[PDB]
């Protein structure tokens, strides 16, 4: 019936706007926490290399 | 769930900064204590050599 096809339309419009959130910060935090962990790891690498050669490794 | 991956990120950031200390003095003291012991040993060597030859050994 036409009234049924007037409520189908009235629910499609509702379920098409459910305040979809932006997933931008929630991922840049992950990127940042990857970089920070990587740096804290690289520090271990550097300080072990010094304890090998009494010198931090040359660049490149 | 996304909230779980928001706390994993919040703990990775914490455990990546635990005030990692500089291990520079704690090793130069060891180097110094090696050199001092070596010198105190060399003194014994010199003073035994004198008691052999009535003279400290010539240089080189």
Resolution in A: 4.1
Query: How distant is the alpha carbon of residue B4 from its chain centre?
Result: 43
The token duo for A16 is: 């098409």
Nearest neighbour of B13 by CB, restricted to A36, A43, A51 = A36
The technique by which this structure was obtained is: cryo-EM
**By CA distance, what is B14's nearest residue in A?**
A33
Question: What residues 7-36 of chain A have any CB closer than 8 A to a CB of chain B?
Answer: 26, 29-30, 32-34, 36
Q: How far apart are CA A47 and CA A51, in angstroms?
A: 6
Q: Which residues contact A29 (CB under 8 A, 6 or more apart)?
A: B6, B9, B10
**Residue A33: other Cβ atoms inside 10 A:** 19
Q: How far apart are CA A27 and CA B6, in angstroms?
A: 9
- Number of cross-chain residue pairs from A and B with Cβ atoms under 8 Å apart: 28
CA atoms within 13 A on the CB side of A29: 16
| Minimal CA separation from B26 to chain A, in Å | 12
- Sign of torsion, CA B40 B41 B42 B44? positive
The token duo for B24 is: 């520079």
């Amino acid at each position: 019936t036409l009234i049924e096809l007037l409520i189908v339309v009235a629910i499609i419009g509702i379920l098409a706007a459910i305040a979809i959130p932006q997933f931008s910060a929630y991922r840049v935090k992950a990127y940042n926490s990857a970089a920070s962990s990587d740096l804290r790891n690289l520090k271990t690498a550097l300080e072990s290399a010094f304890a090998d050669d009494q010198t931090y490794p040359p660049e490149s």
